[PDB]
TrEMBL record, chain B:
Receptor for glutamate that functions as a ligand-gated ion channel in the central nervous system and plays an important role in excitatory synaptic transmission. L-glutamate acts as an excitatory neurotransmitter at many synapses in the central nervous system. Belongs to the glutamate-gated ion channel (TC 1.A.10.1) family. The chain crosses the membrane at residues 2-24. It is found in: Postsynaptic cell membrane; Postsynaptic density membrane. It comes from Mus musculus (Mouse). This is Glutamate receptor. It comes from the Eukaryota.
TrEMBL record, chain E:
It is found in: Postsynaptic cell membrane; Postsynaptic density membrane. It comes from the Eukaryota. This is Glutamate receptor. Belongs to the glutamate-gated ion channel (TC 1.A.10.1) family. L-glutamate binds at S37, T38. It comes from Mus musculus. The chain holds residues 639 to 687 of 883 of the full protein. The record marks R43 as: Interaction with the cone snail toxin Con-ikot-ikot. The record marks I16 as: Crucial to convey clamshell closure to channel opening.
Length: 151, 28, 101, 124, 49, 49, 49
């Protein structure tokens, strides 16, 4: 309870938590429903700077793709932790009863099978980030005492 | 408990303090 | 030919009138033939519009502030004892010495 | 930051200052013999040269473990001159010129540790 | 103090964290299925990793 | 059991398990909507848990 | 649901709530009083002797 977590003011996340009949998500909804500070932000960018200014006090709940882009393609002062709570999926559409659904669906599955969508994602999300990948090799937490502690 | 960079700093600080004390006990 | 929707929203069924807003609206009313864009697959949309296989999976994730390196200070070894203790030790050190003399 | 090479450059400033006093006392010993018992001034010179050569041996040893090989090259020729003193074991004008260069070399390299150390501490 | 903090609580970390990390160390011999989806996917792969 | 192993790293490629339906059959227009309703209701996640 | 779920605090959450306690003179003054008391007693027996 030390970190207050909030979501968008009017979005799909708030509607999902309002109809989530899960004990893990139910207790989270009643906590976010009654809170003295602002646990709902109208703009996703206003909630982003709120997390950067809270410094470990506001955990914003957003989608996976938007979280990975705002972490890599922006000054990386925040990071994504944990797996996805629910499961969704994007998709291109087509008017009801149109001849441009069959071949289009076959082209989407063909691109996803040939490893093309994974390449386009890794190019626009990682190969073009703002702060980049500084020290890609994750420095393991050295259990030994550092030198600066007794400097 | 102590990183390898500190163990190398202790030995040279030990010899450094020793030679400094030897130099101080020489001017007298 | 690629063109951006004028409304700039994805839109759903309006509560007052049964009209679809945004990109899904232009598809149902025949204003567009293909809508390639990030569009979450839901029940109300698929019931009126056709969808293809999901080209990207996602989920509600958590975003917290990245903990910095937190470089300790130069005098970090003086943390277990407060500043008042260190000074009181020095003043007690000189006090005992003068008394002993 | 705080590296092992940064600490090695800090011990040199305290130790090289003591090497400065040795080469200065050597010039005073040479000046006294030039003006003019005699064994006293020469025997005291033999007792002073041994620590001066042994202390510099640590300068070539500390930087060897500190991976600062760009500084070791500035001290290897100084240690090679000590080998000629131990291998062989007028002379007044020769020793005078062989001592003024020591004061200049032990001072120009002294300012390096005063600046190369800052090039690592504040560069965090 | 550090030796007392060590034996009190233990924090064992995994030697790896992703697939793009083990492809650079090459210290752990990793294996897959003989014939299936994984083998066919790793066969025709355009990405470098 | 005995839970001696564990999963590390994220998913490399993401494919889906779809409910099959005959080509000439008219059940696709029903099973698609039913699967989407079950996914929106959060029943598949609870069933998996 | 109406008593434990709709609660302001949580028992499972604030279980440890451990914080780094920096020691101060508030609990160490016990040895400083004996230190001065020992010096006063030593100066007293010295004057008596
Ligand atoms: O069909 C939809 N497509 C959406 C696509 C995106 C993204 F592509 F990630 F931008 C987002 N965001 C994720 C986090 O909040 C900011 C924008 C929300 C979408 N919503 C919910 P809405 O915007 O509240 O209507 C939809 O309903
Ligand atoms: C009386 C003066 C007391 C000075 C105490 C200074 C403590 C500073 C600690 C952090 C140092 C960071 C460079
Ligand atoms: C910090 C170093 C100070 C050195 C002062 C030296 C003063 C020497 C005075 C006598 C010089 C005699 C020259 C022949
Ligand atoms: C915290 C600033 C004062 C530190 C004084 C340290 C004294 C050590 C010897 C008693
Ligand atoms: C750093 C390159 C030179 C290494 C010399 C080792 C002896
Ligand atoms: C106490 C002596 C420690 C010596 C360490 C030498 C390098 C491992
Ligand atoms: C501000 C405290 C300075 C202490 C200097 C060392 C006293 C023994």
């Amino acid at each position: 309870t030390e970190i207050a977590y909030g979501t968008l003011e009017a979005g799909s996340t708030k509607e999902f938590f309002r109809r989530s009949k899960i004990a893990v998500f139910e207790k989270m909804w009643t906590y976010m429903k009654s809170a003295e500070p602002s646990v709902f932000v109208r703009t996703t960018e206003e909630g982003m700077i709120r997390v950067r200014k809270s410094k470990g006090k506001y955990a914003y709940l957003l989608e996976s793709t938007m979280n990975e882009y705002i972490e890599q393609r922006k000054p990386c002062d925040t990071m994504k932790v944990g797996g996805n709570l629910d499961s969704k999926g994007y998709g291109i559409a087509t008017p009801k009863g149109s001849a441009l659904r069959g071949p289009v669906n076959l082209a989407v599955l063909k691109l996803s099978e040939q490893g093309v969508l994974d390449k386009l994602k890794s190019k626009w999300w990682y190969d073009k980030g703002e702060c980049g990948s500084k020290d890609s090799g994750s420095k393991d937490k050295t259990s030994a005492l550092s030198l600066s502690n007794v400097a | 408990p102590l990183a390898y960079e500190i163990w190398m700093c202790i030995v040279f600080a030990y010899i450094g303090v020793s030679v400094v004390l030897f130099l101080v006990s020489r001017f007298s | 030919r690629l063109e951006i929707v004028s409304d700039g929203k994805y839109g759903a069924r309006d509560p007052d009138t049964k009209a679809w807003n945004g990109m899904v609206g232009e598809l149902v009313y025949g204003r567009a033939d293909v809508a390639v864009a990030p569009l979450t697959i839901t029940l109300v949309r698929e019931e009126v519009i056709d969808f293809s296989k999901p080209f990207m999976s996602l989920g509600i994730s958590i975003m917290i502030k990245k903990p910095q390196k937190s470089k300790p200070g130069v005098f970090s070894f003086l943390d277990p004892l407060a500043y008042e203790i260190w000074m009181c030790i020095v003043f007690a050190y000189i006090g005992v010495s003068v008394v002993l003399f | 930051a705080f590296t092992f090479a940064a600490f090695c450059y800090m011990l040199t400033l305290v130790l090289c200052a003591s090497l400065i006093f040795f080469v200065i006392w050597h010039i005073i010993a040479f000046d006294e013999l030039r003006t003019d018992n005699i064994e006293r001034i020469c025997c005291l010179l033999r007792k002073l040269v041994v620590p001066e050569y042994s202390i510099h041996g640590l300068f070539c040893l500390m930087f060897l473990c500190a991976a600062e090989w760009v500084t070791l090259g500035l001290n290897i020729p100084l240690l090679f001159y000590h080998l000629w003193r131990y291998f062989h074991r007028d002379i007044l004008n020769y020793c005078q010129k062989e001592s003024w260069c020591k004061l200049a070399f032990y001072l120009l390299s002294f300012f390096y540790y005063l600046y190369s150390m800052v090039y690592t501490l504040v560069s965090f | 103090a550090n030796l007392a903090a060590f034996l009190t609580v233990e924090r064992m970390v995994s030697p790896i964290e992703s697939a793009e990390d083990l492809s650079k160390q090459t210290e752990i011999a990793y294996g897959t299925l003989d014939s299936g989806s994984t083998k066919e996917f790793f066969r025709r792969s355009k990405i470098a990793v | 059991k005995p839970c001696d192993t564990m999963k590390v790293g994220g998913n490399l490629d993401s494919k889906g398990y779809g409910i099959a339906t005959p080509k000439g059959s008219s059940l696709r227009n029903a099973v698609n909507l039913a699967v989407l309703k079950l996914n929106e209701q959060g029943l598949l996640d609870k069933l998996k848990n | 649901k109406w008593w434990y779920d709709k609660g302001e605090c949580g028992s499972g959450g604030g279980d440890s709530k451990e914080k780094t306690s920096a020691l101060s003179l508030s609990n160490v003054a016990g040895v400083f009083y004996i230190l001065v008391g020992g010096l006063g007693l030593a100066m007293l027996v010295a004057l008596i002797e």
